Design a protein around this ligand. Sequence first.
Ligand SMILES: CC(C)CCn1nc(N2CCCC2)c(O)c(C2=Nc3ccc(NS(C)(=O)=O)cc3S(=O)(=O)N2)c1=O
Length: 557
Amino acid sequence: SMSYTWTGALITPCAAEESKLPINALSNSLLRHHNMVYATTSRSAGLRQKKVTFDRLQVLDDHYRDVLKEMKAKASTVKAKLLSVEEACKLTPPHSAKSKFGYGAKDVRNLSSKAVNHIHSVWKDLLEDTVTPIDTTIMAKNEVFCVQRKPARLIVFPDLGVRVCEKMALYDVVSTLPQVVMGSSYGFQYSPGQRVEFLVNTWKSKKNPMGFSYDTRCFDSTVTENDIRVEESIYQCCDLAPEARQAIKSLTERLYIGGPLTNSKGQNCGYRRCRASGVLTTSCGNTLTCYLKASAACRAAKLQDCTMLVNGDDLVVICESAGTQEDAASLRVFTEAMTRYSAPPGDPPQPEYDLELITSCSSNVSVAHDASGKRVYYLTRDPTTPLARAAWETARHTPVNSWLGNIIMYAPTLWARMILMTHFFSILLAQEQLEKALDCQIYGACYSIEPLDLPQIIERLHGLSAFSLHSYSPGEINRVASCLRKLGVPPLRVWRHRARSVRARLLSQGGRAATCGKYLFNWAVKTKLKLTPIPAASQLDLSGWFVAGYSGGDIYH
Ligand SMILES: CC(C)CCn1nc(N2CCCC2)c(O)c(C2=Nc3ccc(NS(C)(=O)=O)cc3S(=O)(=O)N2)c1=O
């Protein structure tokens, strides 16, 4: 069937949309080539609709069914609980889209009566009706990039009432099931450091390692009714309350399999027969489906000593090489199998024999050196999108602060330390907003973070090593330098100069601010300070951070 059917009604915005980078008094200090930076808007949604609309064929063989049986046997060991209305409510982000039925996210969060009462009626309807398709809104994402222009991604999501109900039925399931079914292959269980560790140990575990990333073309669109029903049958293996079983059956039939699409004006835009990108099960559903298909394709291609790492639609495989000719042949067969299962590639995969050249989840393993001179592996990425977004964020308040997310996830990196930390601490100092909590997104879920906790956060996730790294790789240094030339970002020596100032200003404030100065900016001084563990570091509850992925899942932790 077709992934989408369209009526011709447009995908429409809620408010005016900016596509050009906003400029303020701070912009030039970060980036001179403003025309290189853009945001996607609904006005390009038609281009996206074109790309994501196609027929899906699916041919399922014994490998597919063998792997599904295995996954189901592991899923049968999972026991999951229903969430209360109140529990689900507290998982709703403050900025989440309002209901059509007369309440908003903040009415949900402080548990207003009107909100709770509608949520109860949505649940009851789900229990009582397992056939009536549930309304969804289709919107165009506003995301920031550097010109290479990408059309807007689409988001499809049900009403706030339903979203709360999804959490009630499925939050526990999607939080716990994937690691049990997929074990070490489940990507969202890892911090950046742990992900590095897994990749490195896996690479070393092979006599002659070969790895490839596999890019499915428009993964959500390739997901069929079959796939979504199969994913439900996996959830149904769990030990669940009777109401949970019913609600999951109902959500699958009425929501997950497909449904009508409504624009922000209330017009029927058409019909969806593929993955909704804005439902609770998007991440878990995609991960299970990617893993199921990839696992079976590995068996089809007879890949030797395969190890998969799967993060929703993002897939990387490390295996034993058979030489370049046989590896190329193997991947072609792997790709043929994936194609038959309805996951054909965007870029065809290519075997890689250098771990540092494998990009997976937009990132790669690289190497630098700690204080002792000892080599330390860490996760990095091309800093172009991070810097484009940081520039947008310099002039505009956004619901999600990608700069803060990038500092957390990419703290050991040359570009996050020298540029992101320096820039945004300067901004926070000037406004005296060091103490103000900011929202960021990690593995799809929204976190309120106090910037002053950064040193504790980085110590816990990455270790004190992250404040001491030096002698980065020629490839990494060149990629950063190239990026700065592209965007017209000041050379790394200007940032060192600015960092000395930011460090000194922070030290003058004493307290947590001084702690930021000492740890975050020790790289900036010729004669360093001795960095020892931070006392308060244990107090922070980082449980829940790297357990599961929740993209489009409307989660607040
Ligand atoms: C250590 C890490 C692997 C480095 C790269 N990195 N960095 C992230 N962050 C850096 C600062 C902002 C968040 C981040 O959250 C993700 C991330 N991975 C995903 C991959 C694939 C899908 N596909 S889907 C729609 O769920 O089917 C979704 C997600 S996500 O939305 O849960 N977020 C990430 O991969």
